[PDB]
């Protein structure tokens, strides 16, 4: 009946048992309430199904009904399913920042996302500041970074640089960050990373009516089309503000725009499973898109207020190693999970205890009204016989008058017990309400979560947005083109790395990137460009490709 599950976040493994009929949400909530995360909208639980495919957990469906690969324990990954549009403006809590930084760094380091050498190096220096704080030559000897995972394999395989050298180079830049908090180094990393061309892009293999091979790209900003040969530079794009309805039939996927003049944007997945995943991410990214176009909610403003307050609280409070910080954090999560589960079981017990009591009390309250209403009947019938026997002897009138009064004594006794039971019922309702509150204190508000697809064919209308909606890509510029310092550091790094670069080890994406840089392109320029024209124009462009 009861199942063991393991959930791995980027900074913790949590091992715990759940009930046989625990919903995806009940699992998800236990994960986040432990680590203290309230920005739930970005996140989900990946697993492997019996068919060996990566799958997200559905919140309002029993976990055992979702066909998680059968293991002991069940294996889950807590991961960001959706990225913010602008990290600097959006990420509120420290824990949400940490988990993104860790998930994105992992993508860069594992070569899921292309990151060029210069950026990789710069990013590494922010990474080490995040982990180890300020460089200090008194305490940090040479080879201090021996165990840190610094750069992507691509970037080391193509330069003639000893480990020792890479460490020194990254230490020089690390030194430039003295004074900067760990949280800021994490944010500064992401602020740099979010302008990478492959960042936040969910890719899928698709074909148009013309049967050309293409890549669809779904992100926080909209939909994008790439040629198979080039994932860094998208050729056509649609912002979320131009989309009205999404749906699929088997392998056919139909996108209907807001503009009624423009035709349906239609393409084909190689599999129905692909089209489901696409739809969910579309529904998901579109909804979060629209929230970003509206003012902050009450809960969001509270979070932000709280976040800023706890940031100053932690500043005052502020030494341990990195490996040991991680172990204590992992322990903290275990202790809170343990306490949480204990308190839940108590609250569940108290609730069922209060309910059963309430039920037994309401039966006894009817039993005391049935016994009272019987005494009232006997009183009324004793008065009727007494009035008729008095008219009709004086010894029987005393015997009847005494018994009538003694029945009133019994009514007074049972109205004192009824009075007691009343206050015991109302006390049970207090206990029930507190238990219920406690249980709900362990759930996350449902309205914070992104709406998820219900279930050969699914989909529907996307909620329209504000009447005053301005898509933010019009005004947006890369941190490099805005910040003179950043630009200069990449410029420096390009010069240093070039003097040990093995040109024979230049990957295909290296060539595409340099071409883009050479042509004055960047993530947002290219987005502005490929969105030009009306919805019809670009739906044509796609079909002709
Ligand atoms: Cl709720």
């Amino acid at each position: 009946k009861s199942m063991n599950v393991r959930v791995t976040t980027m900074d913790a493994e949590l091992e715990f048992a759940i009930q046989q009929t625990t919903t995806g949400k009940q699992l998800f909530d236990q994960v986040v309430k432990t680590i203290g995360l309230r920005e739930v909208w970005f996140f989900g639980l990946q697993y492997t199904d019996s068919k060996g495919d990566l799958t997200w957990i559905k919140l309002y469906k029993k976990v055992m009904q979702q066909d998680v690969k059968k293991e002991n324990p069940l294996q889950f990954k807590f991961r960001a399913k959706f990225y913010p549009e602008d990290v600097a403006d959006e990420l509120i809590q420290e824990i949400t920042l940490k988990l993104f930084y860790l998930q994105v760094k992992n993508a860069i380091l594992s070569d899921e996302i292309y990151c060029p050498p210069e950026t990789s190096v710069l990013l590494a220096s922010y990474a080490v500041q995040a982990r180890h704080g300020d460089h200090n030559p008194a305490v940090h000897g040479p080879g201090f970074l021996a165990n840190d995972r610094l750069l992507p394999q691509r970037v080391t395989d193509q330069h003639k640089m000893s480990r020792e050298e890479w460490e020194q180079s990254i230490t020089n830049w690390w030194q430039e960050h003295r004074g900067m908090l760990r949280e800021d180094a994490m944010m500064e990393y992401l602020k740099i990373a979010q302008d990478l061309e492959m960042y936040g892009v969910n890719y899928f293999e698709i074909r148009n009516k013309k049967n050309t091979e293409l890549w669809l790209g779904v992100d926080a900003l909209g939909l994008n089309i790439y040629e198979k040969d080039d994932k860094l530079t998208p050729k056509i794009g649609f912002p979320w503000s131009e989309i009205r309805n999404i749906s699929f039939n088997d392998r056919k996927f139909i996108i209907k725009p807001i503009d009624k003049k423009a035709p349906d944007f239609v393409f084909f997945a190689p599999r129905v499973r692909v089209n489901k995943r696409i739809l969910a991410l579309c529904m998901g990214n579109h909804e979060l898109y629209m929230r970003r176009r509206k003012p902050d909610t009450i809960d969001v403003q509270q979070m932000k207020a709280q976040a800023r307050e706890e940031k100053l609280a932690k500043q005052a409070q502020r030494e341990i190693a990195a490996r040991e910080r991680a172990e204590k954090k992992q322990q903290e999560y275990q202790d809170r999970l343990r306490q949480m589960q204990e308190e839940m079981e108590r609250s569940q017990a108290n609730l069922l205890e209060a309910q059963d009591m309430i039920l037994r009390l309401e039966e006894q309250l009817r039993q005391l009204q049935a016994a009272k209403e019987e005494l009232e009947q006997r009183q009324n019938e004793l008065q009727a016989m007494m009035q008729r026997l008095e008219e009709t002897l004086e010894d029987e009138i005393r015997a009847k008058q005494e018994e009538v009064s003694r029945i009133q004594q019994e009514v007074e006794l049972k109205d004192s017990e009824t009075r007691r039971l009343q206050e015991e019922v109302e006390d049970a309702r207090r206990k029930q309400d507190e238990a219920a509150a406690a249980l709900l204190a362990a759930t996350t508000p449902q309205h914070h979560h992104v709406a998820e697809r219900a279930d050969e064919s699914g989909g529907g209308d996307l909620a329209r947005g504000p009447d005053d909606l301005v898509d933010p890509v019009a005004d947006r510029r890369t941190l490099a083109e805005r910040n003179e310092r950043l630009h200069n550091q990449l410029k420096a790094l390009k010069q240093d790395l070039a003097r040990s670069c093995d040109e024979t080890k230049e990957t295909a994406m290296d060539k595409i990137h340099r071409e883009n840089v050479r042509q004055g392109r960047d993530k947002y320029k290219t987005l502005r460009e490929i969105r030009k024209g009306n919805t019809k124009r670009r739906v044509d462009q796609f079909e002709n490709m």
Side-chain angles (χ1 to χ4, degrees):
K1 289 157 193 169
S2 179
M3 297 293 265
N4 297 305
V5 305
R6 174 177 313 142
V7 173
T8 302
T9 68
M10 291 298 298
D11 78 344
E13 264 190 350
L14 301 182
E15 279 158 340
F16 60 91
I18 61 169
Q19 291 165 14
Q20 58 165 55
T21 57
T22 292
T23 76
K25 198 184 177 295
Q26 290 179 301
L27 185 46
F28 183 101
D29 288 336
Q30 267 187 72
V31 167
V32 296
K33 285 294 193 177
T34 287
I35 70 180
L37 182 142
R38 299 161 66 196
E39 301 177 82
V40 301
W41 41 88
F42 296 117
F43 300 94
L45 293 154
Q46 291 167 16
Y47 64 99
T48 315
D49 61 17
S50 53
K51 303 185 191 178
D53 305 311
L54 294 184
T55 312
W56 291 101
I57 274 298
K58 290 183 212 157
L59 286 181
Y60 297 104
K61 194 177 178 172
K62 292 168 179 195
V63 164
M64 302 306 116
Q65 296 297 324
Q66 311 203 26
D67 185 41
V68 179
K69 165 170 164 206
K70 300 195 194 71
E71 302 174 282
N72 207 340
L74 293 171
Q75 305 271 222
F76 294 106
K77 285 184 180 84
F78 189 74
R79 290 287 191 275
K81 185 171 183 161
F82 305 96
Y83 290 68
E85 272 181 20
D86 191 358
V87 293
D89 202 77
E90 272 178 76
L91 302 187
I92 304 176
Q93 302 181 258
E94 189 183 335
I95 183 60
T96 313
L97 170 72
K98 174 175 159 196
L99 299 188
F100 256 100
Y101 155 80
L102 290 185
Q103 175 177 325
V104 176
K105 175 178 136 219
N106 188 71
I108 291 168
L109 287 185
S110 69
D111 217 342
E112 275 194 28
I113 285 182
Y114 177 87
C115 178
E118 54 281 9
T119 300
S120 279
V121 174
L122 182 55
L123 283 167
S125 71
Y126 281 112
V128 302
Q129 180 82 25
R131 186 157 208 262
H132 301 301
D134 281 346
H135 179 80
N136 183 358
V139 148
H140 295 120
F144 173 79
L145 298 165
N147 285 319
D148 280 43
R149 193 185 186 206
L150 304 171
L151 302 155
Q153 200 189 326
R154 170 171 38 71
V155 180
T156 61
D157 296 344
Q158 70 189 192
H159 295 253
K160 321 164 216 156
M161 272 192 68
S162 77
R163 172 64 177 198
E164 209 175 356
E165 286 156 32
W166 282 119
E167 296 189 355
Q168 191 58 254
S169 167
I170 296 159
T171 311
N172 299 311
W173 290 103
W174 175 15
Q175 283 177 325
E176 301 295 302
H177 310 321
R178 270 147 176 170
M180 187 186 305
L181 294 169
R182 295 187 181 202
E183 296 69 39
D184 292 330
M186 288 186 291
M187 178 71 75
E188 203 58 41
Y189 189 104
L190 292 169
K191 279 173 48 181
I192 294 170
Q194 85 194 327
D195 302 332
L196 293 169
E197 303 133 317
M198 293 193 63
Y199 168 98
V201 181
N202 300 292
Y203 291 88
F204 304 93
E205 304 189 73
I206 65 146
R207 294 179 157 156
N208 59 8
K209 286 172 177 150
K210 193 184 164 186
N211 206 249
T212 311
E213 281 178 310
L214 301 178
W215 289 105
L216 175 66
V218 182
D219 71 20
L221 313 173
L223 305 186
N224 291 331
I225 311 296
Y226 308 73
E227 293 170 26
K228 274 294 168 107
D229 67 330
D230 173 13
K231 291 179 160 199
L232 311 199
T233 317
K235 306 303 192 161
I236 304 173
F238 310 79
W240 289 118
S241 42
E242 293 179 12
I243 303 301
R244 185 198 70 183
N245 162 103
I246 294 186
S247 37
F248 74 93
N249 189 59
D250 291 323
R251 287 187 188 176
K252 200 182 188 183
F253 200 95
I254 320 180
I255 296 179
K256 302 205 175 169
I258 298 292
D259 180 25
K260 309 271 174 161
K261 304 204 172 209
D264 290 347
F265 163 48
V266 181
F267 65 94
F268 302 83
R271 196 184 175 185
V272 175
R273 193 59 181 175
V274 177
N275 282 322
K276 286 177 197 209
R277 293 181 209 161
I278 290 179
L279 176 69
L281 295 185
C282 283
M283 289 180 78
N285 276 291
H286 176 87
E287 190 187 333
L288 291 173
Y289 180 92
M290 291 303 166
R291 294 182 192 190
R292 294 172 191 121
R293 299 293 85 79
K294 300 180 189 168
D296 289 353
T297 71
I298 303 173
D299 301 13
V300 162
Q301 193 277 325
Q302 176 179 54
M303 283 185 206
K304 279 181 160 148
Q306 204 165 312
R308 297 181 200 185
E309 200 200 336
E310 282 191 50
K311 177 161 179 153
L312 300 181
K314 292 172 197 163
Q315 267 193 34
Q317 285 173 303
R318 301 282 176 184
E319 202 207 329
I320 315 169
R323 180 82 174 178
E324 302 173 329
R325 273 165 161 253
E327 285 168 16
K328 287 190 183 193
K329 203 76 214 174
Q330 166 71 41
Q331 195 178 37
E332 284 170 32
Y333 298 142
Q334 291 167 165
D335 300 345
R336 293 169 47 83
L337 172 49
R338 193 175 295 112
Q339 182 147 49
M340 187 183 142
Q341 288 198 330
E342 186 207 5
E343 283 175 2
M344 282 175 57
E345 288 189 356
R346 192 194 179 178
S347 289
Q348 179 74 39
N350 285 187
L351 191 78
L352 297 201
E353 191 164 49
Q355 282 182 180
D356 162 91
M357 191 168 61
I358 270 165
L359 202 67
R360 288 199 204 168
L361 287 171
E362 282 170 349
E363 186 182 20
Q364 282 161 351
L365 286 162
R366 316 227 165 182
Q367 281 177 34
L368 292 183
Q369 275 190 61
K372 162 171 191 181
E373 283 178 63
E374 189 169 41
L375 287 170
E376 288 180 317
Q377 172 190 42
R378 298 194 186 178
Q379 260 180 30
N380 180 39
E381 282 165 28
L382 269 165
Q383 282 192 348
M385 71 183 69
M386 199 164 56
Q387 294 164 356
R388 291 182 182 187
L389 291 177
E390 277 180 354
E391 291 167 308
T392 308
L393 304 177
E394 299 133 26
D395 196 10
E396 295 173 42
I397 295 162
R398 286 197 206 175
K400 297 288 176 189
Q401 191 187 349
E402 287 163 42
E403 285 184 48
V404 173
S405 287
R406 290 172 191 189
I407 288 179
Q408 187 60 57
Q409 291 180 28
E410 292 197 0
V411 177
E412 286 198 344
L413 184 72
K414 296 201 172 177
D415 280 26
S416 297
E417 296 300 334
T418 295
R419 202 168 167 181
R420 188 207 200 183
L421 298 204
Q422 285 161 9
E423 294 164 46
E424 285 187 354
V425 172
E426 93 184 325
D427 273 323
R429 272 153 193 165
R430 187 178 300 152
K431 190 179 170 188
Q432 165 165 69
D433 285 8
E434 291 166 338
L439 287 180
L440 287 163
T443 73
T444 51
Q446 302 169 59
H447 75 274
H448 290 165
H449 295 268
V450 150
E452 53 175 38
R453 37 158 252 91
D455 58 338
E456 295 208 17
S457 60
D461 309 309
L462 300 177
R464 293 192 176 169
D467 302 319
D468 59 286
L469 182 145
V470 179
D471 180 84
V473 176
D475 294 335
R476 190 160 187 195
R477 306 290 190 274
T478 65
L479 185 66
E481 71 190 329
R482 280 180 288 127
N483 181 37
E484 185 189 38
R485 182 198 174 200
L486 179 53
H487 188 84
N488 286 335
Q489 298 174 312
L490 293 168
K491 191 183 165 161
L493 284 158
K494 280 190 192 171
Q495 291 172 23
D496 308 1
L497 292 173
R499 61 173 172 89
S500 72
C501 177
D502 181 359
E503 299 101 26
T504 69
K505 313 284 194 161
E506 196 152 328
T507 74
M509 293 192 288
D510 291 323
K511 278 166 179 163
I512 297 185
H513 181 69
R514 291 183 198 209
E515 197 47 49
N516 298 345
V517 183
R518 193 203 175 219
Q519 292 182 27
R521 305 186 171 187
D522 68 51
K523 185 165 201 182
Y524 307 107
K525 268 154 204 163
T526 306
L527 276 187
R528 275 185 284 287
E529 196 185 353
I530 72 190
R531 291 172 176 196
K532 280 168 175 183
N534 62 359
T535 314
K536 179 173 176 173
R537 170 159 142 190
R538 298 185 259 89
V539 177
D540 295 331
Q541 288 189 32
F542 167 74
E543 295 284 334
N544 296 319
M545 277 170 66

PDB file of all heavy atoms in Angstrom, residues 25 60 440 443-449, ligand 1:
ATOM      1  N   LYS A  25       0.070  16.373  -6.422  1.00  0.00           N
ATOM      2  CA  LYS A  25       0.183  17.647  -5.720  1.00  0.00           C
ATOM      3  C   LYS A  25       0.655  17.432  -4.296  1.00  0.00           C
ATOM      4  O   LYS A  25       1.424  18.228  -3.752  1.00  0.00           O
ATOM      5  CB  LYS A  25      -1.138  18.428  -5.717  1.00  0.00           C
ATOM      6  CG  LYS A  25      -0.909  19.906  -5.398  1.00  0.00           C
ATOM      7  CD  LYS A  25      -2.183  20.714  -5.274  1.00  0.00           C
ATOM      8  CE  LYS A  25      -1.870  22.158  -4.875  1.00  0.00           C
ATOM      9  NZ  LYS A  25      -1.257  22.296  -3.511  1.00  0.00           N
ATOM     10  N   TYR A  60      -3.066  16.691 -10.150  1.00  0.00           N
ATOM     11  CA  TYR A  60      -4.369  16.325  -9.592  1.00  0.00           C
ATOM     12  C   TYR A  60      -4.757  14.927 -10.034  1.00  0.00           C
ATOM     13  O   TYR A  60      -5.919  14.637 -10.281  1.00  0.00           O
ATOM     14  CB  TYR A  60      -5.435  17.379  -9.956  1.00  0.00           C
ATOM     15  CG  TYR A  60      -5.133  18.754  -9.376  1.00  0.00           C
ATOM     16  CD1 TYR A  60      -4.630  19.780 -10.183  1.00  0.00           C
ATOM     17  CD2 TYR A  60      -5.322  19.018  -8.016  1.00  0.00           C
ATOM     18  CE1 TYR A  60      -4.328  21.039  -9.657  1.00  0.00           C
ATOM     19  CE2 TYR A  60      -5.032  20.284  -7.477  1.00  0.00           C
ATOM     20  CZ  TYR A  60      -4.534  21.288  -8.307  1.00  0.00           C
ATOM     21  OH  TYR A  60      -4.236  22.538  -7.799  1.00  0.00           O
ATOM     22  N   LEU A 440      -3.936  22.169   5.794  1.00  0.00           N
ATOM     23  CA  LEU A 440      -3.905  23.050   4.624  1.00  0.00           C
ATOM     24  C   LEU A 440      -2.674  23.946   4.634  1.00  0.00           C
ATOM     25  O   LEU A 440      -2.190  24.348   3.572  1.00  0.00           O
ATOM     26  CB  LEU A 440      -5.185  23.883   4.531  1.00  0.00           C
ATOM     27  CG  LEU A 440      -6.421  23.092   4.086  1.00  0.00           C
ATOM     28  CD1 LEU A 440      -7.712  23.838   4.395  1.00  0.00           C
ATOM     29  CD2 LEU A 440      -6.335  22.754   2.611  1.00  0.00           C
ATOM     30  N   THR A 443      -0.286  22.553   2.317  1.00  0.00           N
ATOM     31  CA  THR A 443      -0.564  22.574   0.874  1.00  0.00           C
ATOM     32  C   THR A 443      -0.225  23.949   0.311  1.00  0.00           C
ATOM     33  O   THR A 443      -0.188  24.931   1.053  1.00  0.00           O
ATOM     34  CB  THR A 443      -2.043  22.264   0.559  1.00  0.00           C
ATOM     35  OG1 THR A 443      -2.864  23.381   0.925  1.00  0.00           O
ATOM     36  CG2 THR A 443      -2.515  21.013   1.297  1.00  0.00           C
ATOM     37  N   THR A 444       0.032  24.012  -0.993  1.00  0.00           N
ATOM     38  CA  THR A 444       0.318  25.282  -1.661  1.00  0.00           C
ATOM     39  C   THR A 444      -0.931  25.766  -2.382  1.00  0.00           C
ATOM     40  O   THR A 444      -1.652  24.971  -2.995  1.00  0.00           O
ATOM     41  CB  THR A 444       1.449  25.165  -2.697  1.00  0.00           C
ATOM     42  OG1 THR A 444       1.184  24.072  -3.589  1.00  0.00           O
ATOM     43  CG2 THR A 444       2.765  24.954  -2.013  1.00  0.00           C
ATOM     44  N   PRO A 445      -1.191  27.077  -2.330  1.00  0.00           N
ATOM     45  CA  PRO A 445      -2.401  27.533  -2.989  1.00  0.00           C
ATOM     46  C   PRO A 445      -2.468  27.069  -4.450  1.00  0.00           C
ATOM     47  O   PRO A 445      -1.522  27.264  -5.209  1.00  0.00           O
ATOM     48  CB  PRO A 445      -2.304  29.058  -2.869  1.00  0.00           C
ATOM     49  CG  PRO A 445      -1.469  29.270  -1.639  1.00  0.00           C
ATOM     50  CD  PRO A 445      -0.451  28.190  -1.706  1.00  0.00           C
ATOM     51  N   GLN A 446      -3.591  26.454  -4.812  1.00  0.00           N
ATOM     52  CA  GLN A 446      -3.802  25.890  -6.143  1.00  0.00           C
ATOM     53  C   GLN A 446      -3.658  26.926  -7.257  1.00  0.00           C
ATOM     54  O   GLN A 446      -3.187  26.607  -8.348  1.00  0.00           O
ATOM     55  CB  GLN A 446      -5.195  25.255  -6.234  1.00  0.00           C
ATOM     56  CG  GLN A 446      -5.468  24.142  -5.211  1.00  0.00           C
ATOM     57  CD  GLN A 446      -6.933  23.725  -5.172  1.00  0.00           C
ATOM     58  OE1 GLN A 446      -7.496  23.283  -6.179  1.00  0.00           O
ATOM     59  NE2 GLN A 446      -7.555  23.868  -4.006  1.00  0.00           N
ATOM     60  N   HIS A 447      -4.063  28.162  -6.988  1.00  0.00           N
ATOM     61  CA  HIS A 447      -4.078  29.190  -8.028  1.00  0.00           C
ATOM     62  C   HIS A 447      -2.683  29.680  -8.420  1.00  0.00           C
ATOM     63  O   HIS A 447      -2.538  30.360  -9.445  1.00  0.00           O
ATOM     64  CB  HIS A 447      -4.952  30.372  -7.615  1.00  0.00           C
ATOM     65  CG  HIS A 447      -4.333  31.260  -6.580  1.00  0.00           C
ATOM     66  ND1 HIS A 447      -4.431  31.007  -5.228  1.00  0.00           N
ATOM     67  CD2 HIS A 447      -3.634  32.416  -6.698  1.00  0.00           C
ATOM     68  CE1 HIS A 447      -3.807  31.960  -4.559  1.00  0.00           C
ATOM     69  NE2 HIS A 447      -3.317  32.828  -5.426  1.00  0.00           N
ATOM     70  N   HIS A 448      -1.674  29.350  -7.605  1.00  0.00           N
ATOM     71  CA  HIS A 448      -0.278  29.656  -7.926  1.00  0.00           C
ATOM     72  C   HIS A 448       0.258  28.766  -9.024  1.00  0.00           C
ATOM     73  O   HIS A 448       1.146  29.174  -9.775  1.00  0.00           O
ATOM     74  CB  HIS A 448       0.617  29.486  -6.710  1.00  0.00           C
ATOM     75  CG  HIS A 448       0.400  30.515  -5.658  1.00  0.00           C
ATOM     76  ND1 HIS A 448       0.884  30.377  -4.376  1.00  0.00           N
ATOM     77  CD2 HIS A 448      -0.267  31.689  -5.689  1.00  0.00           C
ATOM     78  CE1 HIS A 448       0.542  31.437  -3.666  1.00  0.00           C
ATOM     79  NE2 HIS A 448      -0.163  32.244  -4.437  1.00  0.00           N
ATOM     80  N   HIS A 449      -0.260  27.545  -9.099  1.00  0.00           N
ATOM     81  CA  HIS A 449       0.213  26.586 -10.088  1.00  0.00           C
ATOM     82  C   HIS A 449      -0.271  26.942 -11.488  1.00  0.00           C
ATOM     83  O   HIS A 449      -1.298  27.573 -11.659  1.00  0.00           O
ATOM     84  CB  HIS A 449      -0.219  25.170  -9.710  1.00  0.00           C
ATOM     85  CG  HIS A 449       0.397  24.682  -8.439  1.00  0.00           C
ATOM     86  ND1 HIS A 449       1.571  23.964  -8.407  1.00  0.00           N
ATOM     87  CD2 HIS A 449       0.012  24.834  -7.149  1.00  0.00           C
ATOM     88  CE1 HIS A 449       1.878  23.685  -7.152  1.00  0.00           C
ATOM     89  NE2 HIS A 449       0.950  24.206  -6.367  1.00  0.00           N
TER      90      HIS A 449
HETATM   91 CL1  LIG B   1      -5.978  26.658  -2.428  1.00  0.00          CL
END
